[PDB]
Amino acid sequence: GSHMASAARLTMMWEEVTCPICLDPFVEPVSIECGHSFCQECISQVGKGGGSVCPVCRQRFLLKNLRPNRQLANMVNNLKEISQEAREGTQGERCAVHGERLHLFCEKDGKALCWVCAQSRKHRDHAMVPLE
Amino acid sequence: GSHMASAARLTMMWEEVTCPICLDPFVEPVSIECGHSFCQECISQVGKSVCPVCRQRFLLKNLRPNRQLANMVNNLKEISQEARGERCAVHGERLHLFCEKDGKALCWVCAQSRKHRDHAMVPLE
Ligand SMILES: [Zn+2]
Ligand SMILES: [Zn+2]
Ligand SMILES: [Zn+2]
Ligand SMILES: [Zn+2]
Ligand SMILES: [Zn+2]
Ligand SMILES: [Zn+2]
Ligand SMILES: [Zn+2]
Ligand SMILES: [Zn+2]
């Protein structure tokens, strides 16, 4: 049957589908030699000229050995959907990256945030205020 | 905040972390060249060739760890634990069914999975 997924549990699941370079949910997730995964755009940037080292474990990698890791993108989609299936007859703007409702504004980044955004490493030290 | 994961949604997430070879949740998940992933054991034994899902060629030296998949398994098992009896070893959910073909005790995820859903099952007593 169904189960309640706590806030803490959802945070951990998001963590697993989050790029270590940009700290957003993975977009076109790919893995390098060592098996660590990244957004394809992100690791392509780090490896400009053909290669570099893994930002997590410092093992060497080549851009030609990029591998698609589609299950991670599927898992992002499953997590975004939990937010839309949520609403007990309810509808409004949703975070482009998490699919949760937007109720906060990051003054540093000058954009709206959901609660997942607010707690994440990417924003949790920024100044935030409620939307109005 | 919190959200209800429906049974349908849970099922879908389980499907993503299930090995196409043994039809259980990944144990030591690893990828081959096409990007398809498998338990290390399961794909190793296919080598001892061609991708069971899509048929693209692969080589065993090119296996890569895909640890996110294992971490997700662990996350999904905790969901059941945090809503809390005897528990499925692969899914963490409560056992209430018994498979007459395999002779083992099943959780609701087992029962609806490709692996046992065609098997004769009965309630535990
Ligand atoms: Zn990224
Ligand atoms: Zn690495
Ligand atoms: Zn967000
Ligand atoms: Zn911010
Ligand atoms: Zn397997
Ligand atoms: Zn394949
Ligand atoms: Zn089970
Ligand atoms: Zn069975």
Side-chain angles (χ1 to χ4, degrees), chain A residues 10 13-14 17 24-27 72-87 94-101 114 116, chain B residues 3 9 13:
Chain A
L10 287 165
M13 284 168 68
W14 274 111
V17 296
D24 293 329
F26 285 119
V27 173
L72 270 27
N74 291 348
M75 268 311 318
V76 163
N77 290 335
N78 282 308
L79 292 174
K80 291 196 175 182
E81 299 294 23
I82 303 210
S83 336
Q84 272 95 317
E85 296 174 325
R87 69 220 168 73
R94 301 191 166 266
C95 175
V97 125
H98 303 113
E100 298 281 4
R101 300 292 305 286
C114 78
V116 181
Chain B
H3 296 309
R9 176 58 56 195
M13 300 178 291

PDB file of all heavy atoms in Angstrom, chain A residues 10 13-14 17 24-27 72-87 94-101 114 116, chain B residues 3 9 13:
ATOM      1  N   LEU A  10      12.639  12.278   1.990  1.00  0.00           N
ATOM      2  CA  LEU A  10      12.603  12.888   0.668  1.00  0.00           C
ATOM      3  C   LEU A  10      13.911  13.655   0.389  1.00  0.00           C
ATOM      4  O   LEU A  10      14.505  13.480  -0.694  1.00  0.00           O
ATOM      5  CB  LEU A  10      11.364  13.768   0.458  1.00  0.00           C
ATOM      6  CG  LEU A  10      10.026  13.028   0.267  1.00  0.00           C
ATOM      7  CD1 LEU A  10       8.863  13.992   0.431  1.00  0.00           C
ATOM      8  CD2 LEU A  10       9.881  12.373  -1.106  1.00  0.00           C
ATOM      9  N   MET A  13      16.550  11.267  -0.615  1.00  0.00           N
ATOM     10  CA  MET A  13      16.350  10.678  -1.938  1.00  0.00           C
ATOM     11  C   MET A  13      16.774  11.700  -2.997  1.00  0.00           C
ATOM     12  O   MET A  13      17.412  11.335  -4.007  1.00  0.00           O
ATOM     13  CB  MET A  13      14.914  10.215  -2.093  1.00  0.00           C
ATOM     14  CG  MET A  13      14.652   8.905  -1.333  1.00  0.00           C
ATOM     15  SD  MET A  13      12.902   8.512  -1.217  1.00  0.00           S
ATOM     16  CE  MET A  13      12.476   8.154  -2.890  1.00  0.00           C
ATOM     17  N   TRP A  14      16.458  12.968  -2.731  1.00  0.00           N
ATOM     18  CA  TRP A  14      16.867  14.045  -3.632  1.00  0.00           C
ATOM     19  C   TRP A  14      18.379  14.126  -3.752  1.00  0.00           C
ATOM     20  O   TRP A  14      18.924  14.326  -4.853  1.00  0.00           O
ATOM     21  CB  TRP A  14      16.271  15.390  -3.202  1.00  0.00           C
ATOM     22  CG  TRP A  14      14.897  15.587  -3.781  1.00  0.00           C
ATOM     23  CD1 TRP A  14      13.736  15.597  -3.118  1.00  0.00           C
ATOM     24  CD2 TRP A  14      14.566  15.763  -5.162  1.00  0.00           C
ATOM     25  NE1 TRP A  14      12.682  15.827  -3.952  1.00  0.00           N
ATOM     26  CE2 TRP A  14      13.136  15.896  -5.234  1.00  0.00           C
ATOM     27  CE3 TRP A  14      15.319  15.783  -6.350  1.00  0.00           C
ATOM     28  CZ2 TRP A  14      12.431  16.040  -6.442  1.00  0.00           C
ATOM     29  CZ3 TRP A  14      14.610  15.948  -7.596  1.00  0.00           C
ATOM     30  CH2 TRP A  14      13.172  16.061  -7.611  1.00  0.00           C
ATOM     31  N   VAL A  17      19.994  11.985  -6.354  1.00  0.00           N
ATOM     32  CA  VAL A  17      19.818  12.319  -7.761  1.00  0.00           C
ATOM     33  C   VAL A  17      20.296  13.758  -8.033  1.00  0.00           C
ATOM     34  O   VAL A  17      19.796  14.392  -8.953  1.00  0.00           O
ATOM     35  CB  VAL A  17      18.355  12.135  -8.209  1.00  0.00           C
ATOM     36  CG1 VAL A  17      17.958  10.676  -8.095  1.00  0.00           C
ATOM     37  CG2 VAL A  17      17.349  12.982  -7.401  1.00  0.00           C
ATOM     38  N   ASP A  24      22.179  20.793  -8.643  1.00  0.00           N
ATOM     39  CA  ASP A  24      20.795  20.662  -8.965  1.00  0.00           C
ATOM     40  C   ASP A  24      20.495  19.180  -9.235  1.00  0.00           C
ATOM     41  O   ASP A  24      21.416  18.367  -9.431  1.00  0.00           O
ATOM     42  CB  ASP A  24      20.517  21.413 -10.222  1.00  0.00           C
ATOM     43  CG  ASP A  24      20.670  22.909 -10.050  1.00  0.00           C
ATOM     44  OD1 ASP A  24      20.423  23.445  -8.980  1.00  0.00           O
ATOM     45  OD2 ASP A  24      21.002  23.557 -11.019  1.00  0.00           O
ATOM     46  N   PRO A  25      19.205  18.829  -9.323  1.00  0.00           N
ATOM     47  CA  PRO A  25      18.946  17.494  -9.831  1.00  0.00           C
ATOM     48  C   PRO A  25      19.586  17.251 -11.187  1.00  0.00           C
ATOM     49  O   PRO A  25      19.616  18.154 -12.032  1.00  0.00           O
ATOM     50  CB  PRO A  25      17.426  17.467  -9.916  1.00  0.00           C
ATOM     51  CG  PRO A  25      16.993  18.377  -8.756  1.00  0.00           C
ATOM     52  CD  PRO A  25      17.961  19.513  -8.955  1.00  0.00           C
ATOM     53  N   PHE A  26      20.019  16.016 -11.422  1.00  0.00           N
ATOM     54  CA  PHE A  26      20.756  15.679 -12.640  1.00  0.00           C
ATOM     55  C   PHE A  26      19.952  16.037 -13.885  1.00  0.00           C
ATOM     56  O   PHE A  26      18.764  15.680 -13.965  1.00  0.00           O
ATOM     57  CB  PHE A  26      20.974  14.161 -12.735  1.00  0.00           C
ATOM     58  CG  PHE A  26      22.020  13.611 -11.822  1.00  0.00           C
ATOM     59  CD1 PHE A  26      21.682  12.665 -10.857  1.00  0.00           C
ATOM     60  CD2 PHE A  26      23.366  13.986 -11.938  1.00  0.00           C
ATOM     61  CE1 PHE A  26      22.654  12.137 -10.007  1.00  0.00           C
ATOM     62  CE2 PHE A  26      24.342  13.457 -11.086  1.00  0.00           C
ATOM     63  CZ  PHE A  26      23.982  12.517 -10.111  1.00  0.00           C
ATOM     64  N   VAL A  27      20.606  16.648 -14.881  1.00  0.00           N
ATOM     65  CA  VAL A  27      20.046  16.842 -16.248  1.00  0.00           C
ATOM     66  C   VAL A  27      20.963  16.043 -17.198  1.00  0.00           C
ATOM     67  O   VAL A  27      22.188  16.302 -17.212  1.00  0.00           O
ATOM     68  CB  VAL A  27      20.062  18.336 -16.650  1.00  0.00           C
ATOM     69  CG1 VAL A  27      19.654  18.539 -18.110  1.00  0.00           C
ATOM     70  CG2 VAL A  27      19.145  19.150 -15.711  1.00  0.00           C
ATOM     71  N   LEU A  72      18.761   7.400 -13.195  1.00  0.00           N
ATOM     72  CA  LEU A  72      18.871   8.546 -12.333  1.00  0.00           C
ATOM     73  C   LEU A  72      17.887   9.610 -12.766  1.00  0.00           C
ATOM     74  O   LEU A  72      17.287  10.279 -11.913  1.00  0.00           O
ATOM     75  CB  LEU A  72      20.302   9.119 -12.328  1.00  0.00           C
ATOM     76  CG  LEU A  72      21.285   8.579 -11.295  1.00  0.00           C
ATOM     77  CD1 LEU A  72      21.009   7.170 -10.820  1.00  0.00           C
ATOM     78  CD2 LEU A  72      22.730   8.796 -11.712  1.00  0.00           C
ATOM     79  N   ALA A  73      17.729   9.767 -14.076  1.00  0.00           N
ATOM     80  CA  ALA A  73      16.767  10.758 -14.632  1.00  0.00           C
ATOM     81  C   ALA A  73      15.345  10.258 -14.387  1.00  0.00           C
ATOM     82  O   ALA A  73      14.444  11.018 -14.094  1.00  0.00           O
ATOM     83  CB  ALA A  73      17.009  10.963 -16.140  1.00  0.00           C
ATOM     84  N   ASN A  74      15.121   8.968 -14.572  1.00  0.00           N
ATOM     85  CA  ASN A  74      13.823   8.363 -14.207  1.00  0.00           C
ATOM     86  C   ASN A  74      13.484   8.573 -12.704  1.00  0.00           C
ATOM     87  O   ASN A  74      12.372   8.868 -12.329  1.00  0.00           O
ATOM     88  CB  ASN A  74      13.846   6.858 -14.490  1.00  0.00           C
ATOM     89  CG  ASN A  74      13.883   6.524 -15.992  1.00  0.00           C
ATOM     90  OD1 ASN A  74      13.676   7.373 -16.841  1.00  0.00           O
ATOM     91  ND2 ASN A  74      14.205   5.285 -16.296  1.00  0.00           N
ATOM     92  N   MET A  75      14.482   8.484 -11.868  1.00  0.00           N
ATOM     93  CA  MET A  75      14.280   8.669 -10.422  1.00  0.00           C
ATOM     94  C   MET A  75      13.999  10.118 -10.096  1.00  0.00           C
ATOM     95  O   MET A  75      13.167  10.404  -9.234  1.00  0.00           O
ATOM     96  CB  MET A  75      15.462   8.104  -9.591  1.00  0.00           C
ATOM     97  CG  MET A  75      15.285   6.634  -9.147  1.00  0.00           C
ATOM     98  SD  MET A  75      13.703   6.033  -8.313  1.00  0.00           S
ATOM     99  CE  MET A  75      13.175   7.284  -7.134  1.00  0.00           C
ATOM    100  N   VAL A  76      14.699  11.046 -10.740  1.00  0.00           N
ATOM    101  CA  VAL A  76      14.290  12.439 -10.654  1.00  0.00           C
ATOM    102  C   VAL A  76      12.812  12.628 -11.009  1.00  0.00           C
ATOM    103  O   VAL A  76      12.061  13.321 -10.274  1.00  0.00           O
ATOM    104  CB  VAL A  76      15.120  13.306 -11.603  1.00  0.00           C
ATOM    105  CG1 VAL A  76      14.468  14.680 -11.860  1.00  0.00           C
ATOM    106  CG2 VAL A  76      16.513  13.490 -11.006  1.00  0.00           C
ATOM    107  N   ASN A  77      12.384  12.030 -12.132  1.00  0.00           N
ATOM    108  CA  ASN A  77      10.981  12.146 -12.551  1.00  0.00           C
ATOM    109  C   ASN A  77      10.012  11.554 -11.586  1.00  0.00           C
ATOM    110  O   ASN A  77       8.976  12.130 -11.346  1.00  0.00           O
ATOM    111  CB  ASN A  77      10.750  11.626 -13.984  1.00  0.00           C
ATOM    112  CG  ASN A  77      11.390  12.561 -15.007  1.00  0.00           C
ATOM    113  OD1 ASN A  77      11.569  13.754 -14.721  1.00  0.00           O
ATOM    114  ND2 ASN A  77      11.781  12.045 -16.148  1.00  0.00           N
ATOM    115  N   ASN A  78      10.361  10.425 -10.986  1.00  0.00           N
ATOM    116  CA  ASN A  78       9.512   9.859  -9.938  1.00  0.00           C
ATOM    117  C   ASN A  78       9.365  10.766  -8.712  1.00  0.00           C
ATOM    118  O   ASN A  78       8.255  11.024  -8.228  1.00  0.00           O
ATOM    119  CB  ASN A  78      10.033   8.465  -9.542  1.00  0.00           C
ATOM    120  CG  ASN A  78       9.643   7.406 -10.562  1.00  0.00           C
ATOM    121  OD1 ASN A  78       8.463   7.292 -10.903  1.00  0.00           O
ATOM    122  ND2 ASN A  78      10.593   6.575 -10.969  1.00  0.00           N
ATOM    123  N   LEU A  79      10.463  11.353  -8.283  1.00  0.00           N
ATOM    124  CA  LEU A  79      10.420  12.347  -7.191  1.00  0.00           C
ATOM    125  C   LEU A  79       9.688  13.600  -7.467  1.00  0.00           C
ATOM    126  O   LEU A  79       8.964  14.072  -6.594  1.00  0.00           O
ATOM    127  CB  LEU A  79      11.824  12.678  -6.727  1.00  0.00           C
ATOM    128  CG  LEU A  79      12.518  11.558  -6.031  1.00  0.00           C
ATOM    129  CD1 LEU A  79      13.971  11.957  -5.740  1.00  0.00           C
ATOM    130  CD2 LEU A  79      11.819  11.206  -4.744  1.00  0.00           C
ATOM    131  N   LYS A  80       9.780  14.131  -8.672  1.00  0.00           N
ATOM    132  CA  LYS A  80       8.938  15.260  -9.057  1.00  0.00           C
ATOM    133  C   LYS A  80       7.457  14.954  -9.075  1.00  0.00           C
ATOM    134  O   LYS A  80       6.635  15.857  -8.815  1.00  0.00           O
ATOM    135  CB  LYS A  80       9.227  15.724 -10.456  1.00  0.00           C
ATOM    136  CG  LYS A  80      10.545  16.398 -10.719  1.00  0.00           C
ATOM    137  CD  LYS A  80      10.407  17.105 -12.065  1.00  0.00           C
ATOM    138  CE  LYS A  80      11.619  17.920 -12.389  1.00  0.00           C
ATOM    139  NZ  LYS A  80      11.468  18.644 -13.682  1.00  0.00           N
ATOM    140  N   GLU A  81       7.121  13.713  -9.424  1.00  0.00           N
ATOM    141  CA  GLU A  81       5.734  13.315  -9.513  1.00  0.00           C
ATOM    142  C   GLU A  81       5.086  13.118  -8.200  1.00  0.00           C
ATOM    143  O   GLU A  81       3.867  13.305  -8.104  1.00  0.00           O
ATOM    144  CB  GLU A  81       5.514  12.029 -10.290  1.00  0.00           C
ATOM    145  CG  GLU A  81       5.943  12.036 -11.727  1.00  0.00           C
ATOM    146  CD  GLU A  81       5.151  12.949 -12.588  1.00  0.00           C
ATOM    147  OE1 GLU A  81       4.527  13.918 -12.081  1.00  0.00           O
ATOM    148  OE2 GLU A  81       5.173  12.680 -13.801  1.00  0.00           O
ATOM    149  N   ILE A  82       5.858  12.720  -7.197  1.00  0.00           N
ATOM    150  CA  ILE A  82       5.286  12.605  -5.872  1.00  0.00           C
ATOM    151  C   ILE A  82       4.654  13.942  -5.427  1.00  0.00           C
ATOM    152  O   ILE A  82       3.506  13.956  -4.886  1.00  0.00           O
ATOM    153  CB  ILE A  82       6.289  12.140  -4.828  1.00  0.00           C
ATOM    154  CG1 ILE A  82       6.901  10.785  -5.257  1.00  0.00           C
ATOM    155  CG2 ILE A  82       5.598  12.153  -3.484  1.00  0.00           C
ATOM    156  CD1 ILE A  82       7.344   9.819  -4.167  1.00  0.00           C
ATOM    157  N   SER A  83       5.366  15.044  -5.692  1.00  0.00           N
ATOM    158  CA  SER A  83       4.790  16.408  -5.447  1.00  0.00           C
ATOM    159  C   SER A  83       3.450  16.699  -6.197  1.00  0.00           C
ATOM    160  O   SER A  83       2.516  17.123  -5.570  1.00  0.00           O
ATOM    161  CB  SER A  83       5.793  17.548  -5.740  1.00  0.00           C
ATOM    162  OG  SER A  83       7.170  17.162  -5.667  1.00  0.00           O
ATOM    163  N   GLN A  84       3.334  16.444  -7.502  1.00  0.00           N
ATOM    164  CA  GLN A  84       2.011  16.626  -8.205  1.00  0.00           C
ATOM    165  C   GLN A  84       0.912  15.679  -7.795  1.00  0.00           C
ATOM    166  O   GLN A  84      -0.217  16.079  -7.613  1.00  0.00           O
ATOM    167  CB  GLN A  84       2.134  16.560  -9.710  1.00  0.00           C
ATOM    168  CG  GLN A  84       2.433  17.900 -10.354  1.00  0.00           C
ATOM    169  CD  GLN A  84       3.913  18.104 -10.575  1.00  0.00           C
ATOM    170  OE1 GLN A  84       4.762  17.795  -9.689  1.00  0.00           O
ATOM    171  NE2 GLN A  84       4.249  18.605 -11.772  1.00  0.00           N
ATOM    172  N   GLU A  85       1.218  14.413  -7.614  1.00  0.00           N
ATOM    173  CA  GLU A  85       0.203  13.498  -7.057  1.00  0.00           C
ATOM    174  C   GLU A  85      -0.258  13.886  -5.663  1.00  0.00           C
ATOM    175  O   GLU A  85      -1.211  13.314  -5.158  1.00  0.00           O
ATOM    176  CB  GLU A  85       0.770  12.105  -6.940  1.00  0.00           C
ATOM    177  CG  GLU A  85       1.140  11.479  -8.257  1.00  0.00           C
ATOM    178  CD  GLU A  85       1.840  10.160  -8.046  1.00  0.00           C
ATOM    179  OE1 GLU A  85       2.613   9.983  -7.046  1.00  0.00           O
ATOM    180  OE2 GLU A  85       1.603   9.305  -8.908  1.00  0.00           O
ATOM    181  N   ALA A  86       0.476  14.785  -5.011  1.00  0.00           N
ATOM    182  CA  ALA A  86       0.238  15.125  -3.607  1.00  0.00           C
ATOM    183  C   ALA A  86      -1.100  15.819  -3.388  1.00  0.00           C
ATOM    184  O   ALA A  86      -1.925  15.408  -2.570  1.00  0.00           O
ATOM    185  CB  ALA A  86       1.353  16.038  -3.097  1.00  0.00           C
ATOM    186  N   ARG A  87      -1.278  16.882  -4.152  1.00  0.00           N
ATOM    187  CA  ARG A  87      -2.270  17.895  -3.880  1.00  0.00           C
ATOM    188  C   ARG A  87      -3.707  17.352  -3.712  1.00  0.00           C
ATOM    189  O   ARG A  87      -4.237  16.695  -4.618  1.00  0.00           O
ATOM    190  CB  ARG A  87      -2.191  18.906  -5.026  1.00  0.00           C
ATOM    191  CG  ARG A  87      -2.675  18.334  -6.334  1.00  0.00           C
ATOM    192  CD  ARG A  87      -1.875  18.710  -7.564  1.00  0.00           C
ATOM    193  NE  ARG A  87      -2.384  17.798  -8.575  1.00  0.00           N
ATOM    194  CZ  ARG A  87      -3.584  17.889  -9.153  1.00  0.00           C
ATOM    195  NH1 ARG A  87      -4.416  18.912  -8.903  1.00  0.00           N
ATOM    196  NH2 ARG A  87      -3.937  16.954 -10.015  1.00  0.00           N
ATOM    197  N   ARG A  94       5.180  25.593  -9.576  1.00  0.00           N
ATOM    198  CA  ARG A  94       5.974  24.507  -9.107  1.00  0.00           C
ATOM    199  C   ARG A  94       7.375  24.786  -9.545  1.00  0.00           C
ATOM    200  O   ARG A  94       7.603  25.370 -10.581  1.00  0.00           O
ATOM    201  CB  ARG A  94       5.463  23.173  -9.648  1.00  0.00           C
ATOM    202  CG  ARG A  94       4.037  22.976  -9.210  1.00  0.00           C
ATOM    203  CD  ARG A  94       3.526  21.600  -9.462  1.00  0.00           C
ATOM    204  NE  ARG A  94       2.274  21.386  -8.730  1.00  0.00           N
ATOM    205  CZ  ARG A  94       2.161  20.832  -7.512  1.00  0.00           C
ATOM    206  NH1 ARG A  94       3.229  20.443  -6.804  1.00  0.00           N
ATOM    207  NH2 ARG A  94       0.951  20.669  -6.996  1.00  0.00           N
ATOM    208  N   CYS A  95       8.297  24.385  -8.693  1.00  0.00           N
ATOM    209  CA  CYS A  95       9.733  24.493  -8.933  1.00  0.00           C
ATOM    210  C   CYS A  95      10.031  23.695 -10.175  1.00  0.00           C
ATOM    211  O   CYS A  95       9.571  22.533 -10.305  1.00  0.00           O
ATOM    212  CB  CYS A  95      10.438  23.856  -7.739  1.00  0.00           C
ATOM    213  SG  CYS A  95      12.190  23.735  -7.852  1.00  0.00           S
ATOM    214  N   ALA A  96      10.792  24.308 -11.074  1.00  0.00           N
ATOM    215  CA  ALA A  96      11.169  23.644 -12.331  1.00  0.00           C
ATOM    216  C   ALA A  96      12.044  22.378 -12.118  1.00  0.00           C
ATOM    217  O   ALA A  96      12.066  21.458 -12.921  1.00  0.00           O
ATOM    218  CB  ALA A  96      11.840  24.610 -13.253  1.00  0.00           C
ATOM    219  N   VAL A  97      12.675  22.281 -10.970  1.00  0.00           N
ATOM    220  CA  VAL A  97      13.680  21.247 -10.748  1.00  0.00           C
ATOM    221  C   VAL A  97      13.135  20.166  -9.775  1.00  0.00           C
ATOM    222  O   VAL A  97      13.484  18.991  -9.933  1.00  0.00           O
ATOM    223  CB  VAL A  97      14.911  22.055 -10.320  1.00  0.00           C
ATOM    224  CG1 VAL A  97      15.508  21.654  -9.023  1.00  0.00           C
ATOM    225  CG2 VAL A  97      15.812  22.440 -11.527  1.00  0.00           C
ATOM    226  N   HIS A  98      12.335  20.558  -8.752  1.00  0.00           N
ATOM    227  CA  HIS A  98      11.782  19.613  -7.789  1.00  0.00           C
ATOM    228  C   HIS A  98      10.322  19.298  -7.999  1.00  0.00           C
ATOM    229  O   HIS A  98       9.857  18.276  -7.517  1.00  0.00           O
ATOM    230  CB  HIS A  98      12.055  20.076  -6.353  1.00  0.00           C
ATOM    231  CG  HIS A  98      13.506  20.290  -6.056  1.00  0.00           C
ATOM    232  ND1 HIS A  98      14.026  21.527  -5.792  1.00  0.00           N
ATOM    233  CD2 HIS A  98      14.556  19.427  -6.026  1.00  0.00           C
ATOM    234  CE1 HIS A  98      15.338  21.440  -5.642  1.00  0.00           C
ATOM    235  NE2 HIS A  98      15.682  20.165  -5.751  1.00  0.00           N
ATOM    236  N   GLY A  99       9.573  20.099  -8.766  1.00  0.00           N
ATOM    237  CA  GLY A  99       8.137  19.859  -8.840  1.00  0.00           C
ATOM    238  C   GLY A  99       7.288  20.218  -7.592  1.00  0.00           C
ATOM    239  O   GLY A  99       6.067  20.015  -7.605  1.00  0.00           O
ATOM    240  N   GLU A 100       7.908  20.759  -6.529  1.00  0.00           N
ATOM    241  CA  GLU A 100       7.173  21.197  -5.328  1.00  0.00           C
ATOM    242  C   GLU A 100       6.720  22.624  -5.515  1.00  0.00           C
ATOM    243  O   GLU A 100       7.213  23.414  -6.371  1.00  0.00           O
ATOM    244  CB  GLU A 100       8.045  21.097  -4.073  1.00  0.00           C
ATOM    245  CG  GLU A 100       8.533  19.724  -3.689  1.00  0.00           C
ATOM    246  CD  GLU A 100       7.470  18.904  -2.976  1.00  0.00           C
ATOM    247  OE1 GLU A 100       6.331  19.334  -2.827  1.00  0.00           O
ATOM    248  OE2 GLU A 100       7.753  17.792  -2.609  1.00  0.00           O
ATOM    249  N   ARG A 101       5.753  22.989  -4.702  1.00  0.00           N
ATOM    250  CA  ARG A 101       5.186  24.336  -4.733  1.00  0.00           C
ATOM    251  C   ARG A 101       6.205  25.387  -4.278  1.00  0.00           C
ATOM    252  O   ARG A 101       7.035  25.132  -3.415  1.00  0.00           O
ATOM    253  CB  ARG A 101       3.915  24.366  -3.882  1.00  0.00           C
ATOM    254  CG  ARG A 101       2.813  23.416  -4.329  1.00  0.00           C
ATOM    255  CD  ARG A 101       2.225  23.853  -5.672  1.00  0.00           C
ATOM    256  NE  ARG A 101       1.798  25.234  -5.506  1.00  0.00           N
ATOM    257  CZ  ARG A 101       0.720  25.626  -4.826  1.00  0.00           C
ATOM    258  NH1 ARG A 101      -0.145  24.726  -4.308  1.00  0.00           N
ATOM    259  NH2 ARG A 101       0.495  26.941  -4.690  1.00  0.00           N
ATOM    260  N   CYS A 114      11.327  26.205  -3.839  1.00  0.00           N
ATOM    261  CA  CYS A 114      10.496  25.308  -3.095  1.00  0.00           C
ATOM    262  C   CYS A 114      11.222  24.912  -1.773  1.00  0.00           C
ATOM    263  O   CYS A 114      12.343  25.332  -1.514  1.00  0.00           O
ATOM    264  CB  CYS A 114      10.159  24.089  -3.945  1.00  0.00           C
ATOM    265  SG  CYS A 114      11.444  22.829  -4.094  1.00  0.00           S
ATOM    266  N   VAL A 116      12.407  22.032  -0.888  1.00  0.00           N
ATOM    267  CA  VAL A 116      13.581  21.207  -1.228  1.00  0.00           C
ATOM    268  C   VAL A 116      14.795  22.097  -1.574  1.00  0.00           C
ATOM    269  O   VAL A 116      15.879  21.923  -1.023  1.00  0.00           O
ATOM    270  CB  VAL A 116      13.265  20.177  -2.312  1.00  0.00           C
ATOM    271  CG1 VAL A 116      14.505  19.328  -2.627  1.00  0.00           C
ATOM    272  CG2 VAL A 116      12.119  19.279  -1.818  1.00  0.00           C
TER     273      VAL A 116
ATOM    274  N   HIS B   3       4.949  13.685   1.952  1.00  0.00           N
ATOM    275  CA  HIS B   3       3.960  13.402   0.919  1.00  0.00           C
ATOM    276  C   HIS B   3       3.667  11.911   1.046  1.00  0.00           C
ATOM    277  O   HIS B   3       4.576  11.166   1.298  1.00  0.00           O
ATOM    278  CB  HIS B   3       4.465  13.711  -0.520  1.00  0.00           C
ATOM    279  CG  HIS B   3       4.761  15.160  -0.787  1.00  0.00           C
ATOM    280  ND1 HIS B   3       3.869  16.166  -0.506  1.00  0.00           N
ATOM    281  CD2 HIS B   3       5.845  15.771  -1.327  1.00  0.00           C
ATOM    282  CE1 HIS B   3       4.397  17.338  -0.812  1.00  0.00           C
ATOM    283  NE2 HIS B   3       5.596  17.129  -1.323  1.00  0.00           N
ATOM    284  N   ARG B   9       3.109   4.602  -7.287  1.00  0.00           N
ATOM    285  CA  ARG B   9       4.332   5.358  -7.409  1.00  0.00           C
ATOM    286  C   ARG B   9       5.509   4.580  -6.818  1.00  0.00           C
ATOM    287  O   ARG B   9       6.613   4.569  -7.382  1.00  0.00           O
ATOM    288  CB  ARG B   9       4.114   6.708  -6.722  1.00  0.00           C
ATOM    289  CG  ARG B   9       5.316   7.647  -6.656  1.00  0.00           C
ATOM    290  CD  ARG B   9       5.874   7.998  -7.994  1.00  0.00           C
ATOM    291  NE  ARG B   9       4.861   8.589  -8.859  1.00  0.00           N
ATOM    292  CZ  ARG B   9       4.976   8.738 -10.185  1.00  0.00           C
ATOM    293  NH1 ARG B   9       6.053   8.359 -10.855  1.00  0.00           N
ATOM    294  NH2 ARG B   9       3.973   9.280 -10.862  1.00  0.00           N
ATOM    295  N   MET B  13       9.110   3.273  -8.688  1.00  0.00           N
ATOM    296  CA  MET B  13      10.454   3.433  -8.139  1.00  0.00           C
ATOM    297  C   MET B  13      11.182   2.103  -7.896  1.00  0.00           C
ATOM    298  O   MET B  13      12.393   1.990  -8.203  1.00  0.00           O
ATOM    299  CB  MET B  13      10.422   4.282  -6.871  1.00  0.00           C
ATOM    300  CG  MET B  13       9.861   5.682  -7.134  1.00  0.00           C
ATOM    301  SD  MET B  13       9.727   6.723  -5.674  1.00  0.00           S
ATOM    302  CE  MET B  13       8.447   5.896  -4.830  1.00  0.00           C
TER     303      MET B  13
END
